[PDB]
Amino acid sequence: QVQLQESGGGLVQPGGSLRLSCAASGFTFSNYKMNWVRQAPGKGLEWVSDISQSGASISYTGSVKGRFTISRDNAKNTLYLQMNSLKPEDTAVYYCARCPAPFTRDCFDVTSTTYAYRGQGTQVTVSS
Amino acid sequence: QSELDQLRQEAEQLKNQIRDARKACADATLSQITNNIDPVGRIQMRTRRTLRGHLAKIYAMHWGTDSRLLVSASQDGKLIIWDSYTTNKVHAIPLRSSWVMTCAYAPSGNYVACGGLDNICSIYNLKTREGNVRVSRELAGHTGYLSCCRFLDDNQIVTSSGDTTCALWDIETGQQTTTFTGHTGDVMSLSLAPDTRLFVSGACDASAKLWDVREGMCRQTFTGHESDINAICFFPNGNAFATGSDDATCRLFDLRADQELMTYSHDNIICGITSVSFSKSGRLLLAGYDDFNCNVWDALKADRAGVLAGHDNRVSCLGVTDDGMAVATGSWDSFLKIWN
Amino acid sequence: NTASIAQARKLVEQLKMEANIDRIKVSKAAADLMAYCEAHAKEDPLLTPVPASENPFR
Amino acid sequence: EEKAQREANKKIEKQLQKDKQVYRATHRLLLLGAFETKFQVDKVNFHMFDVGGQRDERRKWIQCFNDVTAIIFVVASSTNRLQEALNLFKSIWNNRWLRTISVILFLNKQDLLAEKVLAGKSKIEDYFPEFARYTTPEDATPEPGEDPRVTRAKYFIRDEFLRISTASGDGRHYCYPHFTCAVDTENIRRVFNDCRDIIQRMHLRQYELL
Amino acid sequence: AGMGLLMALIVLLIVAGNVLVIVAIAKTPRLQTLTNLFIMSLASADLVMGLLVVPFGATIVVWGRWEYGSFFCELWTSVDVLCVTASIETLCVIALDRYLAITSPFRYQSLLTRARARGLVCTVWAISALVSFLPILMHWWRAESDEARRCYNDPKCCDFVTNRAYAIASSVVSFYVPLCIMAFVYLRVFREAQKQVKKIDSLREQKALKTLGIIMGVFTLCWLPFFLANVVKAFHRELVPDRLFVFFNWLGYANSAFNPIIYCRSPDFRKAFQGLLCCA
Ligand SMILES: COC(=O)N[C@H](C(=O)N[C@@H](Cc1ccccc1)[C@@H](O)CN(Cc1ccc(-c2ccccn2)cc1)NC(=O)[C@@H](NC(=O)OC)C(C)(C)C)C(C)(C)C
Ligand SMILES: CNC[C@H](O)c1ccc(O)c(O)c1
């Protein structure tokens, strides 16, 4: 399969730090651009950030730039993206998702479910 | 809630059970079983005839039963039916919708099919008229683009759509008899087993499902591909099938072991796969790539049976005649090439 | 949430149906595949170059 | 016999000749962002198609759209639906089979945006960074309009779209942004002027001239 | 064998490149486009040049005199003028096609078709034949000078000495009108390409000074000296030496080989050229 199990999350007070780790299995990690997609309650899926195969081409959603950072460990087949100075507006179900085609600079990932190359995600709540 | 939680836990337990059951049935490997056989070596195939006359890129093709006539579908809005032996036109069908992603030739040689980014399967009859082409029936029950369609005998047609569901259609009644639900991504290619009883279907969820036409419920699911499956073809015996994918790989899946038997890939290939098809004896697996060519793979040794050059644009469709005399490939260069 | 749990239940039933299936040894399936390929190898007009007389495309 | 087959093939090719003429005459266009629409402007065929009848899965039916003259991308200038348009435009520009297609970008709902930006309802600066460090360009035509604050945000969205356009697509890509939301019937004219330049730039490159 | 190598080389390059262009377009259907049909006309004209006039002109130069007969001399001269004017007018037609494709894209797509391209090449060849074949067998070119009289009656004299009327009319209708047409259309195309400097990014700007100059540079540097001499000769014969007149004629023959090297630089051509030059 293409299972992508995500970890981390939970309840963290605003202004703290929290880390997500998503494990990859069934595909070559080095051949795929990976990106995180979040979904606040009620609201739809919003792209958070993406990272290229080599970890060079890195971009972020404007609302999260300067607070979150994304890094991948190709040897360990895991993708990490960090919380810094969380806000109550970032409570969502963060997902780790994979670009559909290998060795491609373009992705069509964010979809209202029905996207196989994405995990079940971890719920993150910032309420204190 | 926690209900979905333990349901997902049960699903994971069942997946682990399926995985360890598959592992327990892996006493040998195709590589060492085939190893003693004589290598096929280099096979040279040359363009016998180039079929020119289409306007836009050709997206799909299908041979007839008699290995004489093939139908070509292009995004220009045409369904030109060719005669391979004498490279002429038999019929030229103008499509109501300009975009067609699939075409089928009826085994009886009386009907033809098309469909695409219109969610309707148009059936054109080539016999009953005094000489003309008319839409006999239009099948509109799909919520997504049609990607592949195949006639069963003369009246039942199975269609794969982007609506994540396949369907069995009764042409005479114009009604969707049975639906095939259980996929996750858009279904691209379906292949009918010989002596039609059950068919496969590979979708964008990197999984190929084997469906029973009568029962309507998928029997086995084969999840071994890294990326979307763009093509799939049945091995002539009927107990195996090969699946193309965008992962630059073709994998042969057996029906009776629910496992991938051999991986057909090379480090010098990055592009995906567009169409795959077996030869008459199943020795050669022909695969059209996005590396502008159509590599020929030996189906048992997992070796390059021969590099097959050709079109200046990407190949999308690739088919072999029932008698296996020739192999016809169609590309985005609006050209069909016949090789032997 | 109801749609998600219903879909998960359907997936669980499908996986349970796929769990109880008779499986043949992979070696036996490989032997059958290679046996069919060898038996029908003579009739395949692509393994061996067809004589020009029998080939209709030349 | 063979005579009848030859005659039928000749007739089919004769029809295909006129079909080639009509197909080359007609220019196809994609409407993405918001099924068929044929319109006549200065006596040249044009064909618009909106494919909103399919699912959100877009990566594998858009592979079928590569012979069109341009992809007309309409966005709402007002979830963050803006970056969703940005990410979609990135996919169009960088796709292998869409690499030779220009985009006629339309920034629709400007009036809805203009009515929105007259007070701190949803500050773009707090929603998109590098806004407080961005000013209206000197080579701009603001024209008589609203408070010069809106045209700063008006040009910021266009600038951000263009940075994607100029980052790749050496010669097969060109973006044609426009500021239009109100029904005034010159929008289709703006497409004609855009499609003229697309084919003109295509021929200039094809003759190794540009 | 001084001229036996310097002139044998140009004819070989004339034939080697030109037939390689003709076989390339016909073999692969990708190059069988609308504009390349005119390229077929240019290549065919340069090929008949390099097979009928250039080899015989080489002999007429090295041996010092014609050695094939008066009828053969007249036919060779007719083929010379036919090929030259056909090549020049085909260059003019190509320039006009580029102009119509650039300054009127939709009209070009919906106007010029395969039937009209065939009509255009047929018309250009008919016009070249009428300008070349007709007023030669009718002896309109024969001058009434004492020096001209000796050459006509001699069977080993194949020197093109002509009256002023022909030396002016053929020169203008063969080179000057096509030259002016090509210059104007290419200047308009250059101005349109420069207008397409609106590319917003804030030899790209000089690219139009390489492609368009090279089309005019090859044409001007080689054929203008010949028809300048053919014009200065009609007014007064003694200024231009006979050696220079032959010298400039061979520059015009060079475009038969310089034309495949200029108009066949497209990547589609090179892909077909590499596969045609394999010779497995
Ligand atoms: C299938 O074969 C080809 O297309 N042959 C090509 C070819 O040989 N083209 C020539 C055309 C030519 C050569 C000599 C005289 C006239 C025309 C090019 O060699 C011309 N040019 C050399 C050249 C330079 C100046 C001039 C010149 C200048 C003033 C007046 C007249 N000519 C003529 C030739 N070359 C260049 O420097 C570049 N192209 C170019 O100049 O055209 C945009 C290249 C590099 C892309 C080939 C290449 C092998 C180079 C790809
Ligand atoms: C002797 N060679 C003839 C020369 O090539 C030539 C070409 C065109 C003309 O109009 C002409 O008067 C002479």
Side-chain angles (χ1 to χ4, degrees), chain A residues 2 4 7-10 14-42 44-45 47-49 51-72 74-75 77 79-86 88 90-104 106-111 114-128, chain B residues 2-8 10-11 16-22 24-37 39-41 43-44 47-51 53-75 77-87 89-95 97-126 128 131 133 135-137 139-162 164-171 173-174 176-185 187-194 196-214 216 218-225 227 229-236 238-245 248-259 261 263-265 267-290 292-302 304-311 313-332 334-340, chain C residues 1-8 11-15 19-23 26-31 33-36 38-41 45-57, chain D residues 1 4 8 12 16-17 19-20 22-23 25-35 37 39-42 44-55 57-66 68-80 82-83 85-90 92-95 97-98 100-101 103-108 110 112-114 117-120 122 124 126-132 134-137 139-142 144-145 147-148 150-151 153-158 160-169 171 173-183 186-207 209-210, chain E residues 1-2 4 8 10-26 28-29 31-45 47-59 61-64 66 68-106 108 111-113 115-129 131 133 135-136 139-141 143 145 148 151-153 155-163 165-187 189-198 200 202-204 206 208-232 234-235 237-242 244-267 269-270 272-273 275 278-280:
Chain A
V2 288
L4 288 167
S7 93
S17 80
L18 164 153
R19 184 185 190 80
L20 282 68
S21 77
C22 158
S25 78
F27 60 98
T28 36
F29 211 47
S30 156
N31 297 41
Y32 285 105
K33 170 172 212 180
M34 256 200 97
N35 34 24
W36 297 86
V37 190
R38 84 208 201 159
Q39 186 214 303
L45 304 96
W47 163 85
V48 192
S49 147
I51 172 179
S52 147
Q53 293 102 40
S54 83
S57 176
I58 297 181
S59 34
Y60 300 91
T61 280
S63 165
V64 298
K65 192 265 152 187
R67 309 183 299 123
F68 300 165
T69 197
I70 175 162
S71 34
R72 69 189 289 180
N74 249 353
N77 291 353
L79 174 57
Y80 305 102
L81 167 155
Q82 263 274 170
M83 289 335 89
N84 307 291
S85 38
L86 293 92
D90 325 286
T91 171
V93 182
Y94 295 76
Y95 295 94
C96 68
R98 192 197 92 229
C99 201
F103 285 143
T104 313
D106 44 286
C107 305
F108 296 79
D109 133 75
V110 172
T111 311
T114 61
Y115 190 95
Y117 320 151
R118 181 200 316 142
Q120 272 63 240
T122 54
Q123 175 85 61
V124 191
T125 305
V126 186
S127 60
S128 85
Chain B
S2 183
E3 171 185 54
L4 180 64
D5 293 352
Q6 31 72 39
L7 204 52
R8 285 173 174 176
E10 180 173 358
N16 287 344
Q17 222 90 40
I18 217 77
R19 175 151 62 56
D20 84 354
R22 275 151 191 221
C25 286
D27 73 319
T29 302
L30 204 65
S31 174
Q32 40 246 38
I33 285 298
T34 280
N35 175 21
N36 220 335
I37 208 64
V40 190
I43 271 180
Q44 309 78 39
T47 306
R48 258 35 182 194
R49 315 202 193 302
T50 180
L51 300 203
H54 267 280
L55 269 293
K57 67 215 173 64
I58 281 160
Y59 209 99
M61 94 94 68
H62 195 307
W63 280 88
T65 287
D66 63 354
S67 325
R68 173 88 161 204
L69 308 180
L70 54 97
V71 58
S72 169
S74 197
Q75 313 264 40
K78 280 293 191 333
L79 206 49
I80 273 152
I81 271 161
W82 293 93
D83 165 26
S84 267
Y85 291 4
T86 71
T87 183
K89 316 312 182 53
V90 201
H91 307 328
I93 302 190
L95 298 196
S97 181
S98 210
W99 285 272
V100 51
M101 313 208 33
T102 166
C103 49
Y105 212 120
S108 64
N110 307 320
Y111 294 72
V112 80
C114 87
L117 271 163
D118 68 315
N119 310 36
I120 318 198
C121 187
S122 45
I123 287 328
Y124 306 80
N125 172 10
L126 324 174
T128 202
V133 283
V135 189
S136 175
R137 205 70 39 91
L139 301 171
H142 277 286
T143 88
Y145 65 95
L146 259 65
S147 59
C148 169
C149 70
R150 295 275 181 265
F151 283 79
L152 255 66
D153 45 357
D154 205 11
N155 194 4
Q156 318 214 323
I157 164 173
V158 285
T159 41
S160 72
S161 39
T164 322
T165 79
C166 279
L168 177 53
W169 280 97
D170 211 322
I171 292 207
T173 88
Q176 198 178 102
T177 57
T178 76
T179 200
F180 299 123
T181 280
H183 261 300
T184 280
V187 199
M188 294 274 288
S189 182
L190 65 91
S191 212
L192 252 57
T196 168
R197 284 311 330 300
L198 73 176
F199 76 99
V200 292
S201 72
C204 270
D205 64 322
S207 86
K209 305 237 205 180
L210 173 68
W211 303 89
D212 184 317
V213 178
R214 313 277 270 282
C218 62
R219 294 301 191 51
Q220 341 183 27
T221 309
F222 309 87
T223 78
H225 273 291
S227 163
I229 286 171
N230 307 299
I232 183 165
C233 182
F234 249 107
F235 185 97
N239 323 296
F241 60 95
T243 68
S245 54
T249 319
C250 293
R251 301 185 192 226
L252 192 142
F253 281 99
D254 156 18
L255 269 202
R256 274 169 310 181
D258 202 352
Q259 246 165 112
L261 298 203
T263 291
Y264 304 5
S265 82
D267 293 355
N268 287 315
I269 285 145
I270 291 325
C271 60
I273 282 280
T274 39
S275 147
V276 296
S277 173
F278 277 96
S279 297
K280 184 64 169 323
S281 72
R283 192 41 162 289
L284 321 178
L285 176 62
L286 304 122
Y289 274 83
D290 303 359
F292 274 113
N293 310 343
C294 177
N295 309 342
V296 176
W297 279 84
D298 176 18
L300 312 162
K301 207 67 92 183
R304 293 267 269 298
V307 182
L308 181 76
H311 315 86
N313 214 346
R314 144 194 176 165
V315 55
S316 69
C317 73
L318 168 68
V320 189
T321 84
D322 314 75
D323 64 10
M325 216 75 164
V327 163
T329 175
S331 156
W332 280 7
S334 154
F335 295 139
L336 283 161
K337 274 152 141 43
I338 289 274
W339 321 61
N340 277 105
Chain C
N1 201 5
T2 56
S4 183
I5 63 170
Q7 173 56 241
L11 171 54
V12 166
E13 311 315 305
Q14 197 32 241
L15 253 182
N20 293 318
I21 180 63
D22 293 272
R23 297 166 182 267
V26 70
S27 44
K28 286 293 302 302
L33 273 176
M34 100 165 163
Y36 179 65
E38 180 67 29
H40 278 74
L46 231 48
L47 228 40
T48 302
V50 182
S53 307
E54 266 78 12
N55 186 289
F57 297 87
Chain D
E1 60 154 350
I12 283 143
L16 262 284
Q17 200 51 238
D19 289 339
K20 201 173 20 176
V22 182
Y23 181 82
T26 303
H27 307 277
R28 282 137 284 130
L29 285 181
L30 194 81
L31 212 174
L32 212 59
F35 209 108
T37 303
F39 56 87
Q40 265 324 122
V41 315
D42 315 302
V44 47
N45 284 144
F46 260 114
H47 260 207
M48 181 145 268
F49 321 77
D50 159 3
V51 186
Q54 257 85 11
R55 313 171 30 240
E57 217 81 14
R58 214 191 320 280
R59 64 211 211 260
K60 201 147 291 283
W61 70 274
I62 199 137
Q63 270 210 348
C64 154
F65 267 128
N66 76 332
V68 311
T69 325
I71 281 161
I72 288 171
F73 203 84
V74 316
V75 317
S77 305
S78 58
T79 304
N80 197 289
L82 200 45
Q83 193 85 239
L86 289 191
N87 283 52
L88 205 31
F89 183 86
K90 252 171 71 45
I92 308 284
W93 221 244
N94 295 347
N95 188 279
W97 321 93
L98 268 60
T100 69
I101 304 306
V103 154
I104 300 174
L105 166 67
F106 269 145
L107 308 139
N108 163 0
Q110 273 283 166
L112 177 61
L113 164 74
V117 48
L118 268 185
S122 36
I124 292 326
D126 202 59
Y127 210 175
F128 271 43
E130 63 256 37
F131 202 49
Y134 175 106
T135 192
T136 172
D139 50 353
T141 61
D147 179 310
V150 57
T151 166
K154 207 173 101 93
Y155 268 129
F156 166 73
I157 310 163
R158 181 182 72 82
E160 226 280 353
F161 260 87
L162 274 194
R163 314 291 101 201
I164 309 295
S165 94
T166 75
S168 295
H173 275 298
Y174 293 97
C175 174
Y176 307 82
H178 291 332
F179 294 106
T180 189
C181 70
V183 277
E186 75 220 279
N187 248 358
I188 289 285
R189 175 53 50 121
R190 223 168 301 191
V191 152
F192 174 87
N193 290 114
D194 278 17
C195 278
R196 252 188 60 93
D197 280 336
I198 290 165
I199 291 196
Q200 222 193 63
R201 271 141 152 178
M202 142 176 303
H203 281 150
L204 286 169
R205 262 193 36 91
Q206 186 271 290
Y207 290 116
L209 186 49
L210 192 139
Chain E
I10 182 191
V11 47
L12 180 52
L13 302 190
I14 271 180
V15 86
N18 258 254
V19 66
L20 163 154
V21 171
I22 271 178
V23 302
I25 301 263
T28 170
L31 313 204
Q32 291 199 91
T33 182
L34 205 37
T35 180
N36 280 328
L37 192 176
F38 302 129
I39 277 304
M40 202 154 306
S41 188
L42 170 65
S44 324
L47 171 142
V48 52
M49 228 194 272
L51 277 55
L52 210 46
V53 56
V54 201
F56 291 168
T59 76
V61 167
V62 47
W63 296 2
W66 189 254
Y68 301 88
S70 95
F71 172 80
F72 265 5
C73 169
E74 289 181 355
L75 183 73
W76 172 85
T77 279
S78 299
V79 166
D80 197 328
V81 48
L82 175 46
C83 294
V84 168
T85 191
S87 186
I88 287 155
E89 278 195 355
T90 289
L91 296 184
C92 162
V93 160
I94 278 185
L96 280 172
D97 166 76
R98 275 151 128 100
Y99 174 71
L100 173 95
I102 291 297
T103 73
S104 100
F106 302 152
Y108 158 74
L111 173 161
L112 182 176
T113 36
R116 290 148 164 222
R118 261 185 322 192
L120 199 42
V121 287
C122 175
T123 300
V124 81
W125 274 91
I127 272 282
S128 34
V131 171
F133 264 148
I136 282 198
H139 256 272
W140 294 13
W141 68 280
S145 166
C151 194
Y152 305 147
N153 303 302
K156 299 196 59 179
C157 193
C158 204
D159 300 358
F160 205 73
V161 47
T162 48
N163 41 295
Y166 199 137
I168 286 327
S170 147
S171 43
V172 293
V173 86
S174 211
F175 174 75
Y176 283 137
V177 154
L179 171 65
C180 298
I181 284 183
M182 268 199 329
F184 144 87
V185 300
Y186 276 130
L187 183 43
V189 168
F190 169 79
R191 266 147 149 130
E192 274 214 1
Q194 251 201 335
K195 289 172 181 180
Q196 316 275 333
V197 82
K198 59 179 65 175
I200 295 311
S202 318
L203 73 156
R204 179 48 164 272
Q206 201 252 1
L209 287 169
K210 283 192 174 184
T211 300
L212 300 167
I214 271 163
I215 318 190
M216 291 304 85
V218 165
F219 197 62
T220 279
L221 182 32
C222 302
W223 269 130
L224 184 46
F226 183 54
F227 296 99
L228 251 204
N230 205 356
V231 155
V232 78
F235 313 151
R237 273 184 47 238
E238 68 267 11
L239 285 314
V240 46
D242 284 335
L244 225 65
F245 189 93
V246 152
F247 168 23
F248 291 162
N249 196 0
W250 283 91
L251 266 71
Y253 294 129
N255 298 0
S256 294
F258 283 40
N259 274 321
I261 217 177
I262 179 183
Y263 280 98
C264 305
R265 290 209 302 296
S266 177
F269 274 89
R270 239 151 39 224
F273 278 163
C278 85
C279 302

